[PDB]
Amino acid sequence: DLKNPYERIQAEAYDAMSGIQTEGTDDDGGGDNIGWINDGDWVKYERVHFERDASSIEVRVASDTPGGRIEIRTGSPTGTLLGDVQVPNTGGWQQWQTVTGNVQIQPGTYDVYLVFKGSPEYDLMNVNWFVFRA
Numbered sequence: 001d002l003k004n005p006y007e008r009i010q011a012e013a014y015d016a017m018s019g020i021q022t023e024g025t026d027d028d029g030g031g032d033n034i035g036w037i038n039d040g041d042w043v044k045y046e047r048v049h050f051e052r053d054a055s056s057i058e059v060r061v062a063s064d065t066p067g068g069r070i071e072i073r074t075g076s077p078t079g080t081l082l083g084d085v086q087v088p089n090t091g092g093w094q095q096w097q098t099v100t101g102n103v104q105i106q107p108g109t110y111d112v113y114l115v116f117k118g119s120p121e122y123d124l125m126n127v128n129w130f131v132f133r134a
């Protein structure tokens with residue numbers, strides 16, 4: 001039941017969420033993505049174990065709007081910001097690209113939250129999976 005942050009974590013495999021819905025993805029490899037993402041929404045992945053320090057996160061994203069950002073926090077949706085990732089317009093809801101952002105995460109087991117932020121006026125993005133790099 002521990003998750004491995006150094007291999008892809010599928011975004012739909014969350015343990016709790018606020019604000020979002022899942023759908024089948026047209027990204028290569030098929031599977032699913034989370035979507036209907038708005039400013040202040042989040043997803044929680046429990047028991048993410050880091051054996052060594054993480055220095056960045058890579059996220060597979062799509063957006064038909066101006067996009068937004070993903071904040072990486074632990075413990076709760078308000079927990080200390082460990083890094084963020086900018087998500088641009090990608091040309092459509094199933095036009096997928098990989099983006100990256102720096103993080104600083106020390107070894108330990110965490111409840112990881114991705115908290116989505118941007119304009120309140122439009123849905124922000126879709127996310128297929130994410131993975132950390134050491």
Ligand SMILES: O[C@@H]1[C@@H](O)[C@H](O[C@@H]2CO[C@@H](O)[C@H](O)[C@H]2O)OC[C@H]1O
Nearest residue numbers: 023034035036037093123124125126
């Ligand atoms: O996650 C995506 C949803 O956000 C998307 O919903 C659209 C949001 O933008 C609006 O301008 C559209 O009316 C609305 O349907 O649907 C696709 C899904 O991948």
Ligand SMILES: O[C@@H]1[C@@H](O)[C@@H](O)OC[C@H]1O
Nearest residue numbers: 026027028094095096097
């Ligand atoms: O352009 C491609 C798009 O059609 C989808 O499959 O997501 C991956 C992209 O490279």
Ligand code: NA
Nearest residue numbers: 019036037038
């Ligand atoms: Na939402």
Ligand code: NA
Nearest residue numbers: 084085101102
């Ligand atoms: Na960043």
Ligand code: NA
Nearest residue numbers: 010011032128
């Ligand atoms: Na996925």
